[PDB]
Coordinates of C-alpha atoms and ligand atoms in Angstrom, one line a residue:
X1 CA 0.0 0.0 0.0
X2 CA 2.2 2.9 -1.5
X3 CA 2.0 5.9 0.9
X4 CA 3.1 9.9 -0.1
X5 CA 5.3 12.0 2.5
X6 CA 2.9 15.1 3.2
X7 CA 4.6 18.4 5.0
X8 CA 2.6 20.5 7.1
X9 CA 3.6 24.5 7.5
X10 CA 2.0 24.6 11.1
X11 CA 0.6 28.6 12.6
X12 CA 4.0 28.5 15.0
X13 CA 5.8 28.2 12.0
X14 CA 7.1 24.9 12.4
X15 CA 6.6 22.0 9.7
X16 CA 4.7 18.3 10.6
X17 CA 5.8 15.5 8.6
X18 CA 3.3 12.0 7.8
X19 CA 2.6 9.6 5.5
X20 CA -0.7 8.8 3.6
X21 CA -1.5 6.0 1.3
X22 CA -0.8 7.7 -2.5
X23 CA -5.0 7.7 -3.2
X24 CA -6.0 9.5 0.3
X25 CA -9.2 12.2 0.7
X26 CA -8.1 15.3 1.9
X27 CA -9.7 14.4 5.2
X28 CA -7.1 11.5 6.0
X29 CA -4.1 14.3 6.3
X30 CA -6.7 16.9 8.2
X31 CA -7.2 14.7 10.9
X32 CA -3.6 13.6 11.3
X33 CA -2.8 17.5 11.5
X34 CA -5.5 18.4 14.0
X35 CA -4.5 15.0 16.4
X36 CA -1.1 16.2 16.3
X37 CA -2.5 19.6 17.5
X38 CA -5.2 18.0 19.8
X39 CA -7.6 20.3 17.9
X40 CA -11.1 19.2 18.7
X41 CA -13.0 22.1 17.2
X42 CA -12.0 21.4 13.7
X43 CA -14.8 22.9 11.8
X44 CA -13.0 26.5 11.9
X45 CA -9.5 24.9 10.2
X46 CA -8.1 23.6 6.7
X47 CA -4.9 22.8 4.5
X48 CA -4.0 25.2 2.6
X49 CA -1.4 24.4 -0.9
X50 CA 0.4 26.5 -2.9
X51 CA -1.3 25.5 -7.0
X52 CA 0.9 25.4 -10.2
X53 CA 0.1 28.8 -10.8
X54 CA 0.9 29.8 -7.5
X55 CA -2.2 30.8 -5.6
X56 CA -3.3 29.6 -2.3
X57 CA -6.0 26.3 -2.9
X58 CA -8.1 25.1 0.2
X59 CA -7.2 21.5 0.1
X60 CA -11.0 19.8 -0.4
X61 CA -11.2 17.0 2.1
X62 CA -13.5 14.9 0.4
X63 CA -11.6 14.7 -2.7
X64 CA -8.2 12.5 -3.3
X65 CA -5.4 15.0 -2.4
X66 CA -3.1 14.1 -5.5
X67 CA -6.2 15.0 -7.9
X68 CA -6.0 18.6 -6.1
X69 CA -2.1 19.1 -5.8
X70 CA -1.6 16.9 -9.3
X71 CA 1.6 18.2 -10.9
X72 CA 2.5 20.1 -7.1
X73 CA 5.1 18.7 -3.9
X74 CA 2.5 17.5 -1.0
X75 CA 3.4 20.8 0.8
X76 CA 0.5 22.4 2.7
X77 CA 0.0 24.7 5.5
X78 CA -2.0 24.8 7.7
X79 CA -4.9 27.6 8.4
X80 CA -8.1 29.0 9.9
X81 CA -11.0 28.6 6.8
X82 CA -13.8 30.3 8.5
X83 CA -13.0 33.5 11.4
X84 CA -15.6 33.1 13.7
X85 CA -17.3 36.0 14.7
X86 CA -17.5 35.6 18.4
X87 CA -14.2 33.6 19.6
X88 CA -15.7 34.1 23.1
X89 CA -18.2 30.9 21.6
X90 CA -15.3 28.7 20.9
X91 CA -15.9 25.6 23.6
X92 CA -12.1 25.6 23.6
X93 CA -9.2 27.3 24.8
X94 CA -6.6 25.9 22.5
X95 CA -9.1 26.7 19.4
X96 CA -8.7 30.8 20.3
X97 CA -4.8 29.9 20.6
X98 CA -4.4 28.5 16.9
X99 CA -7.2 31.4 16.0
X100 CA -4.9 33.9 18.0
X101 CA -1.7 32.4 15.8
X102 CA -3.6 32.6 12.8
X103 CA -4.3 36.6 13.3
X104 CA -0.7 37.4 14.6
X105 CA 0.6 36.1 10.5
X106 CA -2.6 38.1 8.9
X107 CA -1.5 40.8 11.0
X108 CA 2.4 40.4 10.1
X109 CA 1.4 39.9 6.6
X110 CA -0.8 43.1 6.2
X111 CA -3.6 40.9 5.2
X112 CA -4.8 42.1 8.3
X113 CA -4.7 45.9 8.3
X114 CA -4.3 47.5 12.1
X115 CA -3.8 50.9 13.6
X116 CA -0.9 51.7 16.1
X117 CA -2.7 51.6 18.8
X118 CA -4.4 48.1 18.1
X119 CA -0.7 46.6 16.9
X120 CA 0.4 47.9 20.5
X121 CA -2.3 46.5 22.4
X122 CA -2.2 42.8 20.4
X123 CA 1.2 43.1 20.6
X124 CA 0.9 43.0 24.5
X125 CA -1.2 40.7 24.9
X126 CA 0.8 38.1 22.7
X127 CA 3.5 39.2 24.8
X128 CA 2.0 38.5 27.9
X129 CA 0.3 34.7 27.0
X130 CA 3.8 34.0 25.8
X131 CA 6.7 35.3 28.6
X132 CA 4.0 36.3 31.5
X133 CA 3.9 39.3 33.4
X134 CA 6.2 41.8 32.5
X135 CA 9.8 42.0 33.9
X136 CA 11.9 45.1 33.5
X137 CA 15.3 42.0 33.6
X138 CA 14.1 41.3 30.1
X139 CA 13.4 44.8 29.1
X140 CA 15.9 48.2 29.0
X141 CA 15.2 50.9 27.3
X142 CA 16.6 49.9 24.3
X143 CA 14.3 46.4 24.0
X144 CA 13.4 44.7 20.9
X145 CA 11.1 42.1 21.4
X146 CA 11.4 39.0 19.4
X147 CA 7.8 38.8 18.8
X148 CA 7.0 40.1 14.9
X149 CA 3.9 42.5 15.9
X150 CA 3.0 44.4 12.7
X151 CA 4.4 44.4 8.8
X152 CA 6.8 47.4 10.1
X153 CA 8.0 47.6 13.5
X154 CA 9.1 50.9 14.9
X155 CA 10.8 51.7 18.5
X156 CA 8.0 53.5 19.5
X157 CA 5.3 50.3 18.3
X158 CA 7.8 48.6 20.8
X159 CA 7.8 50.9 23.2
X160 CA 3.8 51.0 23.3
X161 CA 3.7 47.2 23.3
X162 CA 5.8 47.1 26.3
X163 CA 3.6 49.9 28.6
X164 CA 0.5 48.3 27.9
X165 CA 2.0 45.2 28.9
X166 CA 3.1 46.4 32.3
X167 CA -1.0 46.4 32.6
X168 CA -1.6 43.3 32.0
X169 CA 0.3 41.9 35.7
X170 CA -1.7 38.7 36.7
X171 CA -3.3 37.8 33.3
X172 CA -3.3 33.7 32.4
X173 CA -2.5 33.0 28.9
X174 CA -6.0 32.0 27.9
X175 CA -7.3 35.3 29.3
X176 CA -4.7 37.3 27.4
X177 CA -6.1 35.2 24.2
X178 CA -9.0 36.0 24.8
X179 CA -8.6 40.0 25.1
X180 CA -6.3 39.6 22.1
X181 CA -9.5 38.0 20.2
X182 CA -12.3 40.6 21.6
X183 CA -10.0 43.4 19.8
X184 CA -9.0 41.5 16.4
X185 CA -13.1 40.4 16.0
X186 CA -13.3 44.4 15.3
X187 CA -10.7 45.1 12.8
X188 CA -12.9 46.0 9.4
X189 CA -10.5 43.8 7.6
X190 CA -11.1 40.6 10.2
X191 CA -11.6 37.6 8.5
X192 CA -12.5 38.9 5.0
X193 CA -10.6 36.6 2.1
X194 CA -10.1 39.5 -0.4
X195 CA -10.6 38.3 -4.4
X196 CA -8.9 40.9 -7.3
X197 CA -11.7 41.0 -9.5
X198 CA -13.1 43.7 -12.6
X199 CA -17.0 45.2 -12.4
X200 CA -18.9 44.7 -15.4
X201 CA -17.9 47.9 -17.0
X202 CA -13.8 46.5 -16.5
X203 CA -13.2 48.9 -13.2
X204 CA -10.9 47.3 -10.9
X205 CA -12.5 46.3 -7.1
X206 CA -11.7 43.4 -4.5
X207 CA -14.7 41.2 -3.6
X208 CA -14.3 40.0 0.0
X209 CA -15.5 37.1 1.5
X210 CA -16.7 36.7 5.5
X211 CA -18.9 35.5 7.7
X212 CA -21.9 38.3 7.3
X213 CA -21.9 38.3 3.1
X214 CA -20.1 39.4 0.8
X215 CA -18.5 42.8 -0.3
X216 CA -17.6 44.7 -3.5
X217 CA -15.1 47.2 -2.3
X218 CA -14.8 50.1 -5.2
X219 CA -13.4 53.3 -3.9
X220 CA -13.6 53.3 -0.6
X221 CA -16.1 56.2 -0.9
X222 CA -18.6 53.1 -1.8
X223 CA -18.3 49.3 -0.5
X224 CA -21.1 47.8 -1.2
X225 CA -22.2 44.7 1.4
X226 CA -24.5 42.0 0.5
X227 CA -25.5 39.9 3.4
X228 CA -25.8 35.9 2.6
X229 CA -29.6 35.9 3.0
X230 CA -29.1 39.2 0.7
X231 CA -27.6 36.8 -1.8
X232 CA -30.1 34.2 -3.7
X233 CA -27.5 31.9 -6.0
X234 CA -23.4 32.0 -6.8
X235 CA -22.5 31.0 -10.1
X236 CA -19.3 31.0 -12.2
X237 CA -18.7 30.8 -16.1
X238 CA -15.5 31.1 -18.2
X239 CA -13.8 33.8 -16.3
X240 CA -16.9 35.3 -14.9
X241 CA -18.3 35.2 -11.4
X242 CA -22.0 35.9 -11.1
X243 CA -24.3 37.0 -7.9
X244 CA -28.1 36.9 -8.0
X245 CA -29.2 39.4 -5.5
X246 CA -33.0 39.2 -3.8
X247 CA -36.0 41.7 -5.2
X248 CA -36.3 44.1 -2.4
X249 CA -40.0 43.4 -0.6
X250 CA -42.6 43.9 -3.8
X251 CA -39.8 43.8 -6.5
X252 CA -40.4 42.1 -9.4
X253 CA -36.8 40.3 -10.2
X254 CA -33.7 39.2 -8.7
X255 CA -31.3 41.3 -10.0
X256 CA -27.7 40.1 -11.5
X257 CA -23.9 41.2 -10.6
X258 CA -21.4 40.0 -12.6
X259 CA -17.6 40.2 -12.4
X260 CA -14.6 39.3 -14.5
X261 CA -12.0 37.3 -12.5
X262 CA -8.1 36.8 -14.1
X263 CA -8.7 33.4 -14.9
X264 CA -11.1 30.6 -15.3
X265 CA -9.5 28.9 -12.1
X266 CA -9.8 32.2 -10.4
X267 CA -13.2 32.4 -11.0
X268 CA -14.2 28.5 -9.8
X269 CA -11.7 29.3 -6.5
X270 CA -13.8 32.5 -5.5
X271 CA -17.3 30.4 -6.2
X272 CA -16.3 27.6 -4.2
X273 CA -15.4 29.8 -0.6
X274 CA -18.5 32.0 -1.3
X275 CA -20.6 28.6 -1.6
X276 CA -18.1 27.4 1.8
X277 CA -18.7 30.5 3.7
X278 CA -22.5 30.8 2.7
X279 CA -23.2 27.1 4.3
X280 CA -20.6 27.6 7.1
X281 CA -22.3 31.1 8.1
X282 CA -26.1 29.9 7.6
X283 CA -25.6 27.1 10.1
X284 CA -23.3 28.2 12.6
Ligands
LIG1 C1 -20.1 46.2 11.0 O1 -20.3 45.5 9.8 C2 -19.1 45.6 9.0 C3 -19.5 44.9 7.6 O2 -18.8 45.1 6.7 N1 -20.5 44.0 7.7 C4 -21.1 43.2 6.5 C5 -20.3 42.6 5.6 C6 -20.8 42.0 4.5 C7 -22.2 42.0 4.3 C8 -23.0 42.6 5.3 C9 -22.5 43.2 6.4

């Protein structure tokens, strides 16, 4: 029974290695990564690979992993697929932790846009789950923290991190989690997968896609939000993505958005987490 070595890019940055027999579901690999984690509340999670052209894929779990990676190495990481809303709902401590992990990288990456302040005050609260209450041994006035905080770090972002951290004296790590989760829930960017797509008149936007709907972000003087129930049927064709939006109360007719995406495989890959995040988000 010929098995395939799979590598795992875990949220502490560190790499899990297994084996799977050549023909495996996505699922087999999944649940090998979340009992090496002792993840419980899987639901949230997924494998994440790196596609010929280069995008990130959500590795399906009900389909065979080498008809998804195909000409690909079995390299995956892995990620949170749905943000939920209210962490504070999460039955498990160690679920906010990978969540908590998870937001440090989309803050470190800029995925995850933040002001000062906020950077400062995540920053110390990742600061005190991780060393404890603060300890002036550690920290002169010169200090640079080992922690990556933001996707630019100035003395003074350290500086903040470390005075709202001499606040924190007493705090457990789950209870600095959780403080750290109640303030990244907020962030307008919080888990929103943005989408480069053209309107129908060829105008550049970003469709993003959360929990609540979906949005079409134009100029920033207009984003326009359509909640899921908002949205009646998700369709793709070619290189075009289509949204049937409800009639308003005594309307006749749906009415019909359509966008352009890069490519044919852009298109499907938007379709398939709008269809995700619409079953996820109606159930949860
Ligand atoms: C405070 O809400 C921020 C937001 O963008 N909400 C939303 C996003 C998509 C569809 C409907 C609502």
């Amino acid at each position: 029974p010929k098995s395939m070595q799979c590598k795992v890019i875990l949220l502490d940055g560190s790499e899990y290695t297994c084996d799977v027999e050549k023909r495996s579901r996505g699922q087999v690999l999944f649940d090998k990564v979340c009992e090496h984690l002792n993840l419980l509340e899987k639901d949230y999670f997924g494998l994440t690979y790196r596609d010929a052209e280069n995008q990130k894929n959500w590795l399906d779990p009900a389909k065979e992993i080498k008809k998804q990676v195909r000409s690909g190495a079995w390299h995956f990481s892995f990620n949170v697929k749905f943000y939920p809303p209210d962490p504070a709902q999460l039955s498990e401590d160690i679920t906010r932790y990978y969540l908590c992990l998870q937001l440090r990288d989309d803050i470190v990456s800029g995925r995850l846009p933040c002001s000062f302040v906020t950077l400062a005050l995540l920053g110390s609260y990742t600061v005190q789950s991780e060393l404890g209450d603060y300890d002036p041994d550690e920290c002169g006035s010169d200090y640079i923290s080992e922690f990556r905080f933001a996707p630019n770090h100035t003395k003074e972002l350290e500086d903040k991190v470390i005075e709202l951290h001499k606040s924190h004296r007493g705090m457990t790590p789950a209870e600095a989690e959780m403080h750290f989760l109640e303030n990244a829930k907020k962030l307008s960017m919080y888990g929103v997968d943005l989408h480069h797509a053209k309107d129908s008149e060829g105008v550049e936007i970003m469709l993003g896609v959360c929990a609540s709907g979906l949005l079409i972000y134009r100029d920033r003087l207009r984003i326009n939000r359509f909640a899921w129930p908002k949205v009646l049927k998700i369709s793709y064709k070619r290189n075009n993505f289509y949204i049937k939006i409800r009639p308003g109360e005594f309307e006749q007719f749906e009415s019909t958005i359509g966008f352009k995406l890069p490519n044919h495989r852009a298109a499907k890959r938007l379709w398939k987490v709008c269809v995700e995040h619409h079953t996820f988000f109606r159930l949860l």
